[PDB]
């Protein structure tokens, strides 16, 4: 006969049921009162609760839970409700809801035992239907259902502190820019000088076979170190294109188009990086297409470079951080660096079974978040650096490529607020978050990446 329905609960403990009931009741049209919808409020909250109980409610239905059975706030609001029920002779003003399956009649409150409770522990829908028909059978005021109100309240209460905010912040990529390039790229017409059966990529300097020519950044007489009878070669028949011209794209001729030139330069960059990694006192690991490079045990100050552990123990084996490089030119000349983890017994003789390697790589990276990725990657890049702020790729005797140490700094206009340390239990459950059905082929998922 009054205005709105009111419900109390043990807010610190049973918020799930109160949430469900409140949104389901407001969705059907009943104007609900509970402390859940009043988030970010409460100084004299008890006074407001007492006022709305006294003169702003027709219903008061309350949880009957072990936590809420003896809570002081629940007890005091229940006492105020009993006073209001004594005032208004309606004996159904108090509706216990037995959602708790281990609260017998012995420990239920004295003035709640004799009352008739509607069962919610069997199923919330059956209890909701019982409450609805009870509301109808003493003419509880109702509004036509409008779930728009439920949507508005749910997003502005349970989703107000967990939304992306508008403020600019920067990130850190693995796209390392190339500071400078050699002056020119030269195709030499070795012809009879260079045998076709010989594998060009095995040469000391980066050289890849293009038709009958040989395209390198080196010099014609620079390559006489390992292969003879090329001192007779002349610099006239060789064709040189300025690197800035060929990479820009404005260069185009019947000999070579701008499409294959960039791919050739990318392959040259990859080969140069692979050759340069030979003398950087790192160890190599073969992959499907590229190579990975890591640090052996005992090659650093307790295997730590600038307070960062690139190598660490785990159970009965060792893990080492490693990188793989691959160049690209279209969105400015950059080098992608991909981070991987390589497993070993102590510091040498990597595990022959790559299956264990890739399987336990996930369990070794499960506990490494953004910081333990970026810091290790930057530490590895700084370690591989030779001078202050660059890495030198020796392509020629006088020509070398410079790769900047600092990667490109992207920035986004949308940020958020980092919460407290919540991940502690995640790694336990993401080992099972793929086990919700376990039907998906885990082995095929890894193979599907290729």
């Amino acid at each position: 006969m009054r205005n709105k329905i009111f419900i109390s609960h043990a807010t610190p403990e049973d918020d799930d049921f109160t949430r469900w009931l409140s949104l389901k009741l407001i969705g059907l049209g009943y104007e609900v009162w509970c402390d859940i919808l009043f988030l970010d409020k409460g100084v004299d909250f008890w006074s407001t609760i007492e006022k709305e109980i006294r003169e702003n409610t027709c219903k008061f239905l309350i949880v009957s839970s072990t936590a809420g059975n003896k809570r002081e706030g629940v007890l005091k609001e229940l006492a105020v409700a009993t006073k209001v029920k004594k005032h208004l002779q309606d004996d159904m003003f108090i509706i216990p809801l037995a959602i708790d399956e281990n609260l017998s009649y012995d420990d239920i409150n004295i003035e709640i035992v004799r009352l008739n409770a509607i069962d919610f522990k069997k199923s919330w829908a059956k209890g909701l239907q019982d409450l609805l028909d009870a509301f109808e059978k003493q003419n509880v005021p109702k509004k036509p259902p409008d779930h728009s109100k439920s949507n508005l309240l749910y997003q502005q209460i349970f989703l107000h502190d967990k939304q992306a905010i508008e403020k600019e912040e920067t990130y850190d990529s693995n796209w390392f820019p190339i500071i400078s390039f050699p002056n020119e790229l030269r195709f030499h017409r070795y012809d009879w000088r260079l045998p076709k059966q010989f594998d060009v990529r095995t040469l000391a300097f980066p050289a890849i076979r293009y038709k009958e020519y040989l395209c390198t950044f080196a010099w014609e007489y620079d390559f006489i170190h390992q292969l003879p009878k090329t001192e007779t070669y002349n610099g006239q028949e060789s064709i040189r294109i300025s690197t800035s011209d060929i990479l820009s794209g404005r260069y185009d001729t019947d000999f070579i188009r701008n499409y294959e030139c960039q791919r050739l330069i990318v392959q040259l960059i990859n080969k140069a990086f692979e050759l340069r990694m030979k003398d950087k006192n790192v160890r190599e690991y073969q992959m499907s297409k590229t190579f990975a490079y890591w640090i052996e045990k005992g090659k650093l100050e307790k295997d730590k470079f600038e307070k960062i552990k690139l190598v660490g123990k785990q159970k009965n084996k060792y893990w080492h951080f490693g990188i793989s490089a691959a160049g690209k030119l279209y969105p400015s000349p950059v080098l992608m660096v991909s981070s991987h983890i390589i497993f070993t017994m102590d510091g040498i003789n990597l595990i022959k079974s790559k299956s264990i390697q890739h399987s336990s790589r996930r369990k070794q990276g499960k506990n490494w978040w953004n910081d333990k990725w970026r810091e290790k990657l930057l530490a590895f890049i700084r370690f591989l650096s030779d001078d202050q702020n660059a890495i030198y790729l020796n392509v020629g005797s006088e020509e070398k490529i410079l790769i900047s140490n600092k990667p490109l700094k992207f920035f986004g206009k949308m940020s958020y607020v980092t919460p407290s340390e919540v991940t502690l239990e995640e790694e336990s459950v993401l080992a099972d978050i793929n086990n919700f059905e376990e039907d998906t082929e885990d082995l095929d998922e890894l193979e599907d990446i290729e």
Partner: protein, 456 residues
């Protein structure tokens, strides 16, 4: 110092015309878009497995809570979320007593073992649903944990069983009692094999959502879809069974705003190229498949389709696009988009441990972009990606289309997935089950499959 663009979360539509980002919260607050009058479920499984199914059904009505309940919300109960009844009274159970199971466990060839088990399950299902008039809404086939444990590293059960029952045009759902009663499964020292005590609520959520979708009901759909637009994507598979490698299988997957896609089978053709690895259809069968999909849309909507958004992890040559343009009418926009996730562009944060969001975009040109479909979620206060996310690289291979438009559309399309009730999945649904649907196709190749919904 490059720029980044954030695309707002695409809301999905629920019952009573309600749209919200989280499928679980929307379902629990408003229910599925189209209600149904109950799930007359039929279950095939062992007597003990039948007891597991009954116990789980009893457990569903009572609420289930996760450990944190902030990243994996609560489970109110079946009739509380869906407004329909499904329990152990209106149940049509088929006796598959383990005597025949131990007879069929005598084989040693894993392929033959899973094949014969799938045939026995298929025969039981078809006999049950054709011998009598009891309309079983969903056939919940519960595989004993021994069967799958001894027959799992075709070899998978789900793909071939689904292929057989779609040949028989019959809905089904595969479940495991370990997924159902993990508490009853323990290792040597009594610890659970898979501790779901922290994710029990989400387990019930995903099982309930899959069960409801399999009953002909549509849980949700994209609520901010463009008027009169479809998305016809594509899936390939290589048939290694044949001695000649070039032959391959293809399948179109057409998705409307509803999210219940339609799979059109394609004839076997020589498209596997061992040199480059990117497959291309010959013009004849490609145009045949495109005409089939176009006519399916025409009969399903009394109008021509407008967006054959051929999504693939490969490229299309010139003759494929010439054939597609020839098939499509003049007043139709044709766009072929290549989507891949192997390009390393990990954007580590400056400080902290929580990675970048899901939904950040990086524009490269007018045809290529990077979309972050993994990582931290502001609402979930957690990360869908396990480690630092790697964005998916999308590229408009051919045709003219705004890059932000296709970015938002592909994000919204990733938001639509019924087989697993999660906030989102990184790969698009058109490619989510690409491996699964490809294995379904290669399981039943010579069978002529008419245009049928994704639930089969």
């Amino acid at each position: 110092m490059k720029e980044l663009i954030y695309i707002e979360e695409p809301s999905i539509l629920f019952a009573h015309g309600q749209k919200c980002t989280d499928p679980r919260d929307g379902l629990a607050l408003f229910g599925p878009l189209n209600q149904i009058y109950g799930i007359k479920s039929g279950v095939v499984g062992t007597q003990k497995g039948l007891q597991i199914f009954k116990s789980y059904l009893d457990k569903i009505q009572k609420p289930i809570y996760n450990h944190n309940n902030i990243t994996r919300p609560m489970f109110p109960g079946f009739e509380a979320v869906f407004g329909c009844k499904w329990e152990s009274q209106n149940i049509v159970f088929k006796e598959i007593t383990d005597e025949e199971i131990r007879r069929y466990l005598f084989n040693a060839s894993t392929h033959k073992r899973t094949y014969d088990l799938v045939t026995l399950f298929n025969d039981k299902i078809i006999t049950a649903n054709k011998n009598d008039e009891e309309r079983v809404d969903v056939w919940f086939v519960i595989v004993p944990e021994e069967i799958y444990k001894y027959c799992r590293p075709d070899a998978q059960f789900h793909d071939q069983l689904k292929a057989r029952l779609l040949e028989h045009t019959i809905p089904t759902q595969i479940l495991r009692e370990s997924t159902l009663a993990w508490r009853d499964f323990k290792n040597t020292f009594g610890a659970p094999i898979r501790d779901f005590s922290k994710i029990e609520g989400h387990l019930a959520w995903t099982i309930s959502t899959a069960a409801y979708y399999k009953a002909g009901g549509k849980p949700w759909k994209l609520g901010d879809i463009r008027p009169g637009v479809c998305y016809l994507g594509l899936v390939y598979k290589k048939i290694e069974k044949s001695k000649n490698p070039q032959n391959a299988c293809c399948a179109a997957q057409m998705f409307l705003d509803n999210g219940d896609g339609t799979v059109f089978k394609g004839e076997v053709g020589p498209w596997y190229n061992p040199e480059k690895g990117e497959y291309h259809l010959k013009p004849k069968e490609a145009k045949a498949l495109l005409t089939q999909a176009l006519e399916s849309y025409k009969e399903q909507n009394k109008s021509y389709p407008k967006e054959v958004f051929i999504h693939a992890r490969t490229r299309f040559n010139d003759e494929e696009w010439n054939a597609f343009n020839e098939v499509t009418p003049k007043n139709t926009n044709l766009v072929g988009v290549t989507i891949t996730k192997s390009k390393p562009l990990k954007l580590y944060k400056t400080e902290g441990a929580f990675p970048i969001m899901r939904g950040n975009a990086y524009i490269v040109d007018e045809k290529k972009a990077f979309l972050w479909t993994l990582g931290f979620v502001p609402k979930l206060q957690s990360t869908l990606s396990m480690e630092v996310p790697n964005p998916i690289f999308i590229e408009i291979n051919k045709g003219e289309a705004e890059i932000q438009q296709v970015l938002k559309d592909i994000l919204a399309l990733t938001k639509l997935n019924y087989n697993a009730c999660i906030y989102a999945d990184g790969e698009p649904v058109t490619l989510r089950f690409a491996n699964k649907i490809g294995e379904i196709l290669t399981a039943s190749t010579e069978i002529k499959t008419p245009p049928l919904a994704f639930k089969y």
